[PDB]
Subunit: 327 residues, 5 copies
């Protein structure tokens, strides 16, 4: 655990491989590289690939329990102290352009003061962010700077998705503005994404703090400071989002309340339009009858007689409508 | 970073600045002033404005991680220790004069004992309150008096706000009188405002207690005591408000069941008038036909006969109404 | 704060003013009294009186930060340490017959080892209890035993209030008594008063524990023991009302499903009556028509034949109801 | 206070009283007995009796604050250290066959290191089981053996009861086996029963825990371990029961959703029957008319010609629902 | 007690027993065996067998309280140290195809450094898994390896089960895919199984951590570390599952939302079809009448008159639907 060679880390199926000068150095690896704490080496892999998997399960540099903890196993943000070794993994929020369900994006990093290795399956964009700000050399200095910078990308895109849900539900003032119903099958979607992001950020906050509260031998205390309030930077993100689970609590309840209000104002029409069904029992009840008797023969022009008495009934009960509305 | 000349902090596009005397009064900022513990000064911006933002990003008087932080991006009622630097950022309750949604107002203070700087986007009632207090002449003596006074106005207006929420919901005694329903879409914004007040007071409670817990090098211990019971003042304030989220809990559930049981009474009317109008289709059954036979011709004057017999049918099943009310 | 003259305490608009002998008896206040810890005198005010407000805000006997606190603006209980001074503010359970909403029964006591002040606005039956018990010689000895006995009266009066709503709740076993229904808009009163008992007892419990938390120069350790098990009395009242919001929760849900199943019986009757009004369209569909042809003229006396056919259709589909209840 | 005599504890209206030998034996009382820790004595009363109340209020054994409160006051269990005294009060569950509501079957036991005294109101089968253990002859050794045996008794019977409601609700899965509805009001009363058992058990493993850390002068460390793990045996007791309030949480909700599923079946039938009886009203529209014109007289035998078209409306719309189910 | 003979633990009706070589190997028992920590023996039984029942009821090697505890009686995911003894008792997942209810698959272990013994009632597939691990020679080294390996089996199996219903409720995306209903009586099964696995895993996570924090002689610090991240390996298991109680919380609410929505758009038919149900007292209201007058005889061909005026009623008020849709 004192000498590291550039050859065994040099993988053909490796996606990404770099040196770290201490500035943001863009230097791809060789087969004759000196790798230490003075020369940290970023990697990035894809365990779907062939020799990424073989080198992932066979390399003599990293231990055995972290071999098959590193090729698509967990559903959780673990950290694990391995003496000098340090396993982190934490989750990001992307996919293709279209997977709004399954906000799980794994990214797994076995790392120490000398050599890191990062591994993914689907395309992380936060790792694309930490790539895309180092070609000009303003990115990370070392592995500690790498870790706090990728936590800055994670809090930035995770925080943007937090406020993205937040202005999806703050767009739901439509529940009182006209009392417009939200679209059919919609609140379960972002409310689903909301609670699953509770169960991913909610251990990710103290995986960040469990980084920052613990003294790894190779951060700076400035990196532990910005790590500390970046852990809090996830923290009020997560109380924003369980404020949003409350807000979809009231939202999802009172939309059911207002559609049963639509039931009630429908049964206004069922009530009074059932009171239009009232004189039918005497509409046919005197007139659809074929019997040998005298129902209305005693007075000529009987049509206006029932034509006024049925609205004596309708207007009278209509005057009871402004009195009791029952019985 | 020992002393600061008065023109260095001087910003044209600032809202203003000031000079705290220590007697509770104030003096405006001059160009050749001395900024120290002997002469503390409040300086206030509006970071919407242009050179406000330029000085906000380019001054040498505050570190990098508070440079962008005073530019209006977090939903975080946060304190951030920067050694001698001390950032706080707290929330108030306004908008324009008309926004009952979005009761969030950001105010920010970067702070050391010499200069204190408050930046806002929109206006703050509390900052106006300590304005009228400070050209009144018995406002803040110093920066400690600044903090305890601005927290007195923040807690005072927030406590008044949750007070008028409390009498809006204790005004909801239409549950008992008439069982009168609240207006269509009205508890979504009371209950919405209520939970968002939980989210913006509950980190603010321990931003207050997190101020009063540590020993900053510039407060009096009397200001720590005032800070302490004002922290608990907002604390049991939010105990009133989640008492109110329980009270909108029962209130929303019982309005849902009371209009639901109103609907149940409406279909009770539909049921009773349904079995009252059983014999209408049956009277069309016996009497609304066209056959080559004898319907009732063997006995004269059947109109009195059937208009008796359906009525005694209705009264019979009406005795089964009070008798059974089933089947 | 070494000696107090009998006129500074003396207020004309004072409701009560007393002299704790230490023997459990009492004496009224005189004008030339020297009161101390050996002569712990007593007050009771009503701050809505104007001279009560004047002495309440202008006396030199209590500091400024508790001057306004005794003037009736709280929504809450507290205890605030003021060095030698000690503030408690504290709630009770009172009103006349027509105040079962708004249990806001305030009771404020600023005190030390020598003097107390006990201000109210509306009457307090606990203070009425110890006023009913101090003249008979078996009241309190001094201020420690005073607020001991005060907490005795209000915690067993609040305890019997909690017991009273509890016997209403256990009087709601009519849910299984043939599903007998609570009155229209009634559980919002028990549930509302219940949770407002949770809020106005819950900081009160650790007001009491916060009394016996520290040593104070005017209690006994026996009175601290009395304080802790009386806090145990109240806190077990708090678990009583916690289980009452639970049991009231399941009550409020089951009455809603009782309304749902009664409505299911209403539309059960509407379903069976709908199948009873299936032969409307065959009834008029063969018989109420007016066309130039032969519908049933080919066989004489067809009244029994449509009686037979609609009976076998109705009883037939009733047998299909006995087959599979649907389709 | 020392060398307690048998005449002091001799109560005629007591239920019984014995000595504890150490073997689990049993010996009745005399009037010349030496009650010590070498010969511990159990007393058992029924405090509703008049002389039981007289000795209960007037004995020179136990102090004043445990005199009255031992006779029917606490709605809840507790411990209370009284120096040498140790008040305990527990709760068990019994009745006749008919008191399954009101599971408050109390147990008030003042403990002193020589005389231990138990008062009940109604009969408790737990102490009946300890009675069977002691006339059995291998019951309690001493007051410590008394305590572990009574806690084992009502711990076992509490565990059997929570097992009884557990396999009541594990029978409640015919609601997935062809969705058999639970009987009327059945969830409410056992849901009530185990939630008041959350009002008892969560105040019971804490009174056992305040037996656990409480190094009493008369416990044994073996028996400390005995009521330690029998305390946590009750601990997995109440995690069973709040798991069961979750399980009747879901079980309470899903019967409501399946209730509206059956309601959706019958308004499915009301919908299709309403649209299939739309042509009835237009049949009366064309054929229930008495006017001087030519409705359909221009072609002979119109009965088949409209009996076809009503069928093609019915089967036509019946083909529209097989593609749309809507409008 | 020291050199315990293999004949003492030899049971005829044992399911099996072996030694542990320290390599993962397997050797059957004899009756001339010396058992220690150097030769660790594992027994596995089935306590329903009467010979094994007599053995574990009557063997003199294990203590008294663990005798009936190992006899298979109660829902115990717990641990109790007995000095040199150690009772652990855990829960797994097994059954045939038809035991998805009753997820209790108990395994019980009395153990020490020397003689470690496991009882069960129904088969555990995790114990079968470690049997398959040891019979090939790659099983556990010692009793500590036996414990951590059987924890690896059953946490792997419980972990893939909580994964299994975790992606069974992700197969509940029919909620927005056409808003397709879940099957009738289905979420009580899945929702049942995840709350019951909160009931099981929630004491089992800290039976694991309570093993890990307990310095035991028969363990190793490597197995303590492996014990601790297998403890948290489960622990992210259970926050996955209460995340899933939230996700079936929103799912179970919105299915009632969407099926009442199906009722809601369903009674559009019972609104517009109700206002085509109103003119039945008009189209027969003038025309199904038998009276001696002139209803429409003054103008010829009345059939094309109402044949258009019912259209100017229906289409006109149908245009009032596009105006206000109510009243």
């Amino acid at each position: 655990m004192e000498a590291i060679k550039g050859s065994d880390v040099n993988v053909p199926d490796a996606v990404f491989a770099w040196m770290l000068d201490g500035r943001g150095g863009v230097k791809p690896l060789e087969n004759t590289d000196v790798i230490d704490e003075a020369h940290p080496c970023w990697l990035h892999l894809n365990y779907v690939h062939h020799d990424s998997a073989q080198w992932l399960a066979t390399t003599p540099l990293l231990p055995n329990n972290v071999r098959d903890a590193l090729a698509g196993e967990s559903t959780r943000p673990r950290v694990s102290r391995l003496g000098e070794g340090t396993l982190i993994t934490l989750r990001c929020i992307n996919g293709s352009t279209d997977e709004r369900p399954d906000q799980l994006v794994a990214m797994r990093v076995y790392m120490d003061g000398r050599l890191i290795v990062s591994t993914r399956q689907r395309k992380v964009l936060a790792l694309d962010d930490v790539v895309s700000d180092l070609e000009e050399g303003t990115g990370p200095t070392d592995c500690g700077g790498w870790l706090v910078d990728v936590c800055d990308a994670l809090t930035d895109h995770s925080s943007e998705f937090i406020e993205q849900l937040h202005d999806k539900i703050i767009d739901l003032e439509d529940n009182l503005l006209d009392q417009q119903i939200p679209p059919r099958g919609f609140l379960a979607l972002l409310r689903k994404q909301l609670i699953v992001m509770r169960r991913y950020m909610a251990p990710q906050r103290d995986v960040y703090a469990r980084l920052a509260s613990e003294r790894l031998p190779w951060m700076s205390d400035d990196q532990r400071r910005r790590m500390q309030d970046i852990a809090d930077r996830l923290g009020r993100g997560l109380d924003e989002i369980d404020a949003c689970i409350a807000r979809t609590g009231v939202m999802a309840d009172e939309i059911a309340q207002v559609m049963q209000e639509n039931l009630a104002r429908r049964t206004y029409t069922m009530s009074l339009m059932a009171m239009v069904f009232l004189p039918s029992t005497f509409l046919t009840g005197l007139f659809g009858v074929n019997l040998g008797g005298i129902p209305g023969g005693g007075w000529q022009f009987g049509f206006s007689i029932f034509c006024i008495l049925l609205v004596v009934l309708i207007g009278g009960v209509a005057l009871w409508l402004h009195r009791s509305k029952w019985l």
